[PDB]
Amino acid sequence: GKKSKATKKRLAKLDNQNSRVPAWVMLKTDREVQRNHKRRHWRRNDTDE
Amino acid sequence: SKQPDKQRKSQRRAPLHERHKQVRATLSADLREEYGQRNVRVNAGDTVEVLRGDFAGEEGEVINVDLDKAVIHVEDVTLEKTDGEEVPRPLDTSNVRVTDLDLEDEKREARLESEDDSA
Amino acid sequence: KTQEVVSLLEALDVHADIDRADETKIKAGQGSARGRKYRRPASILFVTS
Amino acid sequence: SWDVIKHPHVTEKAMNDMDFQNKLQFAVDDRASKGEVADAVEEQYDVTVEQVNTQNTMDGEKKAVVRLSEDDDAQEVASRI
RNA sequence: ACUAUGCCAGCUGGUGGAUUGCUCGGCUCAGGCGCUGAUGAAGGACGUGCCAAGCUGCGAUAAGCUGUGGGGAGCCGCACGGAGGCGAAGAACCACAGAUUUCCGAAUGAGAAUCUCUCUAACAAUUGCUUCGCGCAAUGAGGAACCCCGAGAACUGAAACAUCUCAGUAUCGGGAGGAACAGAAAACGCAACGUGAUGUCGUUAGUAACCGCGAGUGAACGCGAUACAGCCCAAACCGAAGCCCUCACGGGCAAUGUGGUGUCAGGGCUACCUCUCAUCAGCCGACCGUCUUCACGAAGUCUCUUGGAAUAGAGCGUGAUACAGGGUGACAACCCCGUACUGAAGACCAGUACGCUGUGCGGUAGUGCCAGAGUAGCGGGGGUUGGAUAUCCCUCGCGAAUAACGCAGGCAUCGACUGCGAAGGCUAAACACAACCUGAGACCGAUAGUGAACAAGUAGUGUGAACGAACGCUGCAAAGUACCC
Ligand SMILES: [Cl-]
Ligand SMILES: [K+]
Ligand SMILES: [Mg+2]
Ligand SMILES: [Mg+2]
Ligand SMILES: [Mg+2]
Ligand SMILES: [Mg+2]
Ligand SMILES: [Mg+2]
Ligand SMILES: [Mg+2]
Ligand SMILES: [Mg+2]
Ligand SMILES: [Mg+2]
Ligand SMILES: [Mg+2]
Ligand SMILES: [Mg+2]
Ligand SMILES: [Mg+2]
Ligand SMILES: [Mg+2]
Ligand SMILES: [Mg+2]
Ligand SMILES: [Mg+2]
Ligand code: NA
Ligand code: NA
Ligand code: NA
Ligand code: NA
Ligand code: NA
Ligand code: NA
Ligand code: NA
Ligand code: NA
Ligand code: NA
Ligand code: NA
Ligand code: NA
Ligand code: NA
Ligand code: NA
Ligand code: NA
């Protein structure tokens, strides 16, 4: 397909949202924060684009 | 509120400037007589005596005050970690009594001596 | 002053009821979660004009 | 109210463009055109801009590849900042 | 004495997460308060941190900038890390006010799935005024329900079913406000020598009335309360004496009538008598009360015993206009927050009441000068209602009178009697809801209670409309296990 610039920004963001919770955030929180629940796989999941 | 859930909430959720009142400790008889106050906001630099718990009877200077956890560190009141390091055993201020005051700040001293104000 | 009333009651031989009522029961059950933790005996009714 | 140049884009590919091609790489505002990039780069670094190539990337930013004239030396300009 | 594969019951250790205990969440009641938006809201998108994935905050000045007040020796959100910084030049934090506030969005120059295009140019569209120029303005969209105006079912009940019922309900269209709507009688009709705007609550009463007279349906006047408030035009008679914009000049409106008078206590006119009271337009402008926030705030942290820890037991003391509730290493009025008392502020009551300025009320006699028409009323066809020959409304047709007249008093006509003046208009207060603030509880207590105590409208499902979980608890203190194999 052919993406627009806005679509491109949105896809970019979804990729950024796929990061892990940083190691240092787990230390800062005494492990109260571990999993990223919005974790998305390209195959198994589906975006809104 | 008379309701216990509300009372605890308002204590845990109190904004920073309302937490000073959670770090207060009773004054020694002498200091009570001197400033006409039953207790004070504990400052780092005050000297304090431990009235309750494993450390009761010990005296020492106050090294740290944490408003968020409503807790103080007192010199030499410590626990030994597994590696041998010495770390503070944090204390609730209501287990503690202030023997000496750090008066180095004009504002605090003024409030202490005021009849109509409380430090 | 409350203490004045104490002295008077002591003089009237009646103060022991206040002593009876000075103790609180921490109640069995979940009322404490609603603010109903405590109760105490009833002692003296004072009727004025 | 937005600035044109966000920051130099520093990666190995950027270094090769700097060393071999006399080009500098920037993260720039995605609202900026090639001309605006050329101008801003000239004003900030006191150089002469020959050519600008642009890309909207998958990081959500615009990347500009700015080739400098022979009177200017990219590695020298980059070493200042 | 042997016996495996096995059976039943225990024991030790698992698995599992019930139970008990706990509550940062719910549920429900109550008091207060209540509109936002073209000066671009609500909502959304995308950004924004030293490192930053989520949430929160914020907007290219981006977990923030400024001022005043409060607050105070700490702080750098949730979030306990590494580094580093800020704060006595008074930071953090709180209140009020201001600054900044990307893109989409009613979305408004035009187009577009949050981007783009151009004559740096646009209130698009509809509309009022209009210097006829988008020059000055208006509308649009949102909001938890509440409110008003329209459109309007069916399951169901009648033990079938058609009128009836469910029900003017669900749902749909339009629209207002902090409340709305109603409202100063062409009323009532305990018929009176009586009541006196409207809403609401209690009653009248399951009464009158409707109805295959089946099932069902179902008021009102009055009374007791709450709160109270009464007014302005049109016209007669006057006839430019007037209004709007602009600092001003000047412009616009207005004889198809601006303005004065006047409004059943009928008014006007003529001639009198009398008053400065009513009304209306203005100015000032609160107390108290209520809701919320805040300041100050008494008295043990003594002895022995137990315990890791006294908030336990025993002993000795103390305050109390404070023995509500909470926290603190276990049952705490006296350890800490608070609580009683007293005091301060803001908000609502309210631009209200009181006060004041201006205006001038009213009476007699005379006068057929004025007083709202497709109306009142009648007929045809429907809807609606308890409204029955006597509800309210729509539609087609017909159709008056002029106060010396007209309408009503639950069939029609005529007379009498009593009430009242339609076809112009405004109107405070008492009442509805619950977004928002706060308070409360013989409510639930993590399969309960919200779908949601946790990433909750999250994860996830569906092309979409829409659907939609589960997951709470180390410990007094991380002392969160160094060193060695
Ligand atoms: Cl009556
Ligand atoms: K009205
Ligand atoms: Mg990657
Ligand atoms: Mg003082
Ligand atoms: Mg039980
Ligand atoms: Mg290209
Ligand atoms: Mg547009
Ligand atoms: Mg049936
Ligand atoms: Mg039926
Ligand atoms: Mg039948
Ligand atoms: Mg009905
Ligand atoms: Mg009636
Ligand atoms: Mg007039
Ligand atoms: Mg009907
Ligand atoms: Mg649940
Ligand atoms: Mg399907
Ligand atoms: Na996919
Ligand atoms: Na960047
Ligand atoms: Na409100
Ligand atoms: Na983050
Ligand atoms: Na803002
Ligand atoms: Na406009
Ligand atoms: Na115009
Ligand atoms: Na039936
Ligand atoms: Na049937
Ligand atoms: Na019927
Ligand atoms: Na304590
Ligand atoms: Na008709
Ligand atoms: Na009548
Ligand atoms: Na659970």
Annotated domain spans of chain A: 1-49
- CA quadruple B18, B101, B96, B118: dihedral, nearest 10: -40
Q: Does A25 touch chain D (CB under 8 A)?
A: no
Q: Which fold has domain A1-49?
A: Atp Synthase Epsilon Chain; Chain: I; (1.10.1620)
Number of Cβ within 10 Å of residue B53's Cβ equals 14
Q: Quick one: tokens of B77?
A: 């009141």
Nucleic acid strand E within 7 Å of A22 CB? yes
Task: Kindly report the nearest CA distance between residue B10 and chain C, in angstroms.
Answer: 15
**R_g of chain C, CA atoms, integer Å:** 15
The integer distance in angstroms from the CA atom of B86 to the C1' atom of E87 is: 29
Q: Give me the number of domains chain B comprises.
A: 1
Q: Give me the number of domains chain D comprises.
A: 1
Residues near C43 by Cβ (< 8 Å), separated by ≥ 6?
C17, C18, C20, C21
**Domain containing B84 — which CATH number?**
2.30.30.30
Strand partners, B71: B66
**Domain containing D28 — which CATH number?**
3.30.70.330
Do B and C have ≥3 inter-chain CB pairs under 8 A? Answer: yes
Nucleic acid strand E within 7 Å of A23 CB? no
On the 0-12 / 13-18 / 19+ scale of CB atoms within 10 A, A11 is middle
Distance CA D17, CA D28 (A): 17
* DSSP SS3 for D1: coil
A14 alpha carbon – ligand 15 mean position (Å)? 31
* DSSP SS3 for B45: coil
C-alpha pair distances (Å), D71 with each of D23, D42, D47, D53: 13, 13, 8, 20
Are the beta carbons of C34 and B2 separated by less than 8 Å?
no
Cβ atoms of C49 and C34 within 8 Å: the answer is no
The integer distance in angstroms from the CA atom of B52 to the C1' atom of E262 is: 92
Q: Does A8 touch chain D (CB under 8 A)?
A: yes
Number of Cβ within 10 Å of residue A2's Cβ equals 4
| Length of chain C in terms of residues written | 49
Nucleic strand E contacts from chain B, 61-90, CB < 7 Å: 64-68, 79-84, 87, 89-90
The domain in which residue B88 lies consists of 1-119
The domain in which residue D9 lies consists of 1-81
C-alpha pair distances (Å), D67 with each of A48, B79, B99, D61: 39, 63, 72, 19
Nearest chain C residue to B3, by CA = C35
Q: Which of A8, A13, A15 sits opposite D56 (nearest CB)?
A: A8
Distance CA B68, CA B19 (A): 7
Experimental structure resolution, Å:
2.4
